[PDB]
Amino acid sequence: MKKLVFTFKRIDHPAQDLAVKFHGFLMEQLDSDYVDYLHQQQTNPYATKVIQGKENTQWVVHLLTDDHEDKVFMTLLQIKEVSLNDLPKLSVEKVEIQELGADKLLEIFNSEENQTYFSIIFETPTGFKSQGSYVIFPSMRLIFQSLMQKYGRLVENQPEIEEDTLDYLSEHSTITNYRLETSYFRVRQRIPAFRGKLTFKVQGAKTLKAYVKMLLTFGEYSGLGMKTSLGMGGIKLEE
Amino acid sequence: MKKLVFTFKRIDHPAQDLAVKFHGFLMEQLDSDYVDYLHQQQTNPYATKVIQGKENTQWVVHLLTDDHEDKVFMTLLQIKEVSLNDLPKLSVEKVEIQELGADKLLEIFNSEENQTYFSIIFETPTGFKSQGSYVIFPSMRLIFQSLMQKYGRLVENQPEIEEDTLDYLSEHSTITNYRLETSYFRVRQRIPAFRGKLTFKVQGAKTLKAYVKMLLTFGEYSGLGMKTSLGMGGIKLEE
Ligand SMILES: [Ca+2]
Numbered sequence: 001m002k003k004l005v006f007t008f009k010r011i012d013h014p015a016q017d018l019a020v021k022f023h024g025f026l027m028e029q030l031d032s033d034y035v036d037y038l039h040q041q042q043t044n045p046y047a048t049k050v051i052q053g054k055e056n057t058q059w060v061v062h063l064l065t066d067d068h069e070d071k072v073f074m075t076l077l078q079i080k081e082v083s084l085n086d087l088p089k090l091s092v093e094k095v096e097i098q099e100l101g102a103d104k105l106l107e108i109f110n111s112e113e114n115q116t117y118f119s120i121i122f123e124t125p126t127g128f129k130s131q132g133s134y135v136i137f138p139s140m141r142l143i144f145q146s147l148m149q150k151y152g153r154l155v156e157n158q159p160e161i162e163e164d165t166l167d168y169l170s171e172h173s174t175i176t177n178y179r180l181e182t183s184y185f186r187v188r189q190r191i192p193a194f195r196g197k198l199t200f201k202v203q204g205a206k207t208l209k210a211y212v213k214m215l216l217t218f219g220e221y222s223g224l225g226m227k228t229s230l231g232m233g234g235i236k237l238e239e
Numbered sequence: 240m241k242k243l244v245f246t247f248k249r250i251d252h253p254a255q256d257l258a259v260k261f262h263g264f265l266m267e268q269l270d271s272d273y274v275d276y277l278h279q280q281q282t283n284p285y286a287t288k289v290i291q292g293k294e295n296t297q298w299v300v301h302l303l304t305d306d307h308e309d310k311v312f313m314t315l316l317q318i319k320e321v322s323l324n325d326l327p328k329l330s331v332e333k334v335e336i337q338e339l340g341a342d343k344l345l346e347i348f349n350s351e352e353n354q355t356y357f358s359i360i361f362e363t364p365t366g367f368k369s370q371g372s373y374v375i376f377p378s379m380r381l382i383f384q385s386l387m388q389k390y391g392r393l394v395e396n397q398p399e400i401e402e403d404t405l406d407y408l409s410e411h412s413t414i415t416n417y418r419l420e421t422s423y424f425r426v427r428q429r430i431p432a433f434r435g436k437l438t439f440k441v442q443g444a445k446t447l448k449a450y451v452k453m454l455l456t457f458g459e460y461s462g463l464g465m466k467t468s469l470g471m472g473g474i475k476l477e478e
């Protein structure tokens with residue numbers, strides 16, 4: 001999987017609305033026939049983010065599958081100038097490239113440092129769709145389910161996940177600390193979501209805790225929950 | 240009901256631990272035989288708070304019943320100097336007195352201004368005991384239940400509440416916004432609790448919304464949830 005970070009001179013505009021606009025610009029680069037293909041799965045092979053800085057603005061694009069990477073990676077590198085609505089033509093100052101393959105993930109598993117406590121940071125508005133209406137309070141079952149689904153569909157090409165494992169992961173995980181707040185994401189239907197940081201503990205074998213760490217490490221690329229392609233659900237597993 | 244606010248020169252000490260210490264000092268003033276009586280109900284006729292300020296420290300004591308007020312009110316007024324463990328002898332600079340009776344509550348009901356949105360501020364660590372273990376994420380059912388129980392036991396002398404009303408109040412209330420964080424209260428067993436602010440909307444008749452406003456206004460005195468007498472569950476309904 002690939003992680004591309006486009007750096008612009010600091011853009012004075014509400015970050016959440018850039019993410020939606022950047023997503024539109026991104027679609028205008030791909031073959032329209034290929035775009036319609038992306039609209040026919042529960043999970044897209046890409047996730048985007050927008051991080052505002054003190055002196056810069058960063059557009060993050062995650063390539064999550066090899067097939068998607070094969071047809072898109074070169075195109076994204078050619079990008080030097082971006083033009084969005086109501087905004088002056090943007091110039092790409094830098095482009096960073098990081099990669100996350102099986103070698104790094106498997107390394108995470110057999111690590112000498114096995115974590116019991118895990119701190120998740122919700123950089124962008126994160127939401128879940130459960131039992132009809134939306135969700136404003138995150139739960140471990142919803143977090144693990146979204147990641148297990150995203151992982152199963154993208155790298156294993158399997159429609160459904162192991163419910164016993166989801167039960168097992170939820171029974172042994174418990175939120176201990178959090179600092180959260182509401183944050184609505186505009187797609188223009190306002191979508192309810194949350195933002196901030198939480199901490200949970202895992203009680204069990206080191207083989208279990210390793211799977212959690214891997215699932216979270218993978219999550220930093222795919223994003224967590226709803227509308228990850230539009231800029232939602234950007235997470236970060238702190239050291 | 241009475242609201243006494245004791246003002247000291249700013250005390251350099253963790254506010255949550257003062258609340259526990261002040262509670263001990265408060266018990267050392269009452270008849271030991273009368274103290275044992277307080278330990279024999281699910282709800283105490285008093286609630287305490289500790290609010291840290293920039294230049295002052297405020298000790299709040301709520302008298303919730305007439306009988307408790309009759310035997311305690313005069314004693315609390317005589318207090319000019321307070322001595323707690325590991326602390327220099329404290330001197331009472333001021334003492335403020337406010338009252339909340341049926342006249343103010345009934346006034347709240349027939350108000351010309353009927354609220355749909357309600358913002359609750361959790362000044363001190365608030366916790367609920369539900370289905371065995373504790374609770375870190377507040378819910379409208381837990382909030383209304385605690386207040387309905389506290390109100391029913393204190394002014395109506397009724398052991399249980401109307402479950403249909405609790406169902407009715409929960410079905411029509413919905414959290415829309417919040418800014419919350421974990422905050423453990425030390426009683427020394429660490430008790431998990433939350434802190435901050437939330438906002439919920441009420442969908443229904445004005446008679447329903449008036450009952451909610453009254454219940455919340457009453458809640459500013461009794462406190463919300465667990466261990467209100469020890470300094471927990473101090474709330475504030477903003478204008
Ligand atoms: Ca990381």
Ligand SMILES: [Ca+2]
Binds near residue numbers: 459475476477
């Ligand atoms: Ca008030």
